């Protein structure tokens, strides 16, 4: 390019975001920051789930990993604001909010657990070996496992542990969420092509943002893509388990928003 342009790009090889992509990045980043219930201190801040909760799984589940009702109830108590914030996030992306209402609902149902799991995982704390839920509750593996998630707990913890070394910033988290959200791997969508074009736009912007960041761990982009796949697997395991739960447990134990968002892979 021009002489100044060349000087500035001297140590970039790879494609940077275009100005249009920078706008997309800026909007998504701010959408995430404003909805992630995370200030400046998120660690020193809030609270561990008491040690004596989550050690007593006694409700049966088909896979043999029983549920501790007390821990389950502690989790459902905080889950409604977590779900709500995912919706708040999505509503702030123009490519999402311009979709038919019915498509918006399908996309939210499709990715809600994926995004919640990512948000918990990025708050993994190696020192205490905890995840943080709804931005306030720190939990141990056993507590989250016994409190209803079973093997899904192990999967989120393993993701959180592995993500520590990626040093993701708010933008990278936000773009991961946008890619999870704008997926056509759901049934009943009207605007399939538009949603796919949006996902393609986010993916390319995200790849370019990763180039911009110059991470010092190698193969960063495909490594991050593999984590997207892990999150989708977490979402699928959760969907299967949630069906089970509803078979096992009375409806009064499930907040209405919790029931609504995790509808339909059988119930
Ligand atoms: C309750 C909780 C909230 C959390 O929020 C993440 C975010 O808002 O930052 C993210 C995680 C993964 C869950 C744990 C959870 C997620 C799904 C689910 O069905 C259950 C039942 C056992 C009540 C628990």
Author numbering: 144 to 410
How did the manuscript describe this experimental structure?
The human (h) TR exists in two isoforms, hTRα (NR1A1), and hTRβ (NR1A2). hTRα is expressed at higher levels in heart and plays a major role in regulation of heart rate, whereas TRβ is the predominant isoform that is expressed in the liver and pituitary and is involved with hepatic cholesterol metabolism and regulation of metabolic rate. Thyroid receptor (TR) activation occurs when an agonist ligand such as TH or similar compounds binds to a hydrophobic pocket in the core of its ligand-binding domain (LBD). This causes conformational changes which allow DNA bound receptors to interact with coactivators, mediating transcription.
Arg228 displays a double conformation in the first hTRα crystal form (P212121): a productive conformation identical to that of hTRβ and a non-productive conformation in which it points away from ligand (in green). No residues were observed in the disallowed regions of the plots, except for Arg188 in TRα structure in P212121. First, the GC-1 oxyacetic acid ester oxygen forms a hydrogen bond with the main chain amino group of TRα specific Ser277 residue. The Ser277 side chain hydroxyl participates in a hydrogen bond interaction with the Ile221 main chain carbonyl group, which is not available to Asn331 in hTRβ. This means that Ser277 fails to engage in a hydrogen bond contact with Arg228 analogous to that observed between Asn331 and Arg282. Thus, Arg228 is not anchored by contacts with the subtype specific residue. In addition, Ser277 is displaced by 1.64 Å toward the ligand compared to the T3-bound hTRα. This effect, coupled with the fact that dislocation and the smaller size of Ser relative to Asp in TRβ provides room for the Arg228 side chain to move, permits Arg228 to adopt apparent multiple conformations. In the productive conformation the ligand interacts strongly with the Arg228 residue and with the Ser277 by its oxyacetic oxygen. In the non-productive conformations GC-1 maintains the interaction with Ser277 but the strong interaction of GC-1 with Arg228 is lost, giving way to a hydrogen bond of this residue with the main carbonyl of Ser277. While hTRβ Arg282 binds to the ligand in a single conformation, hTRα Arg228 has the potential to flip away from the ligand in non-productive conformations, resulting in loss of an important interaction for the stabilization the ligand.
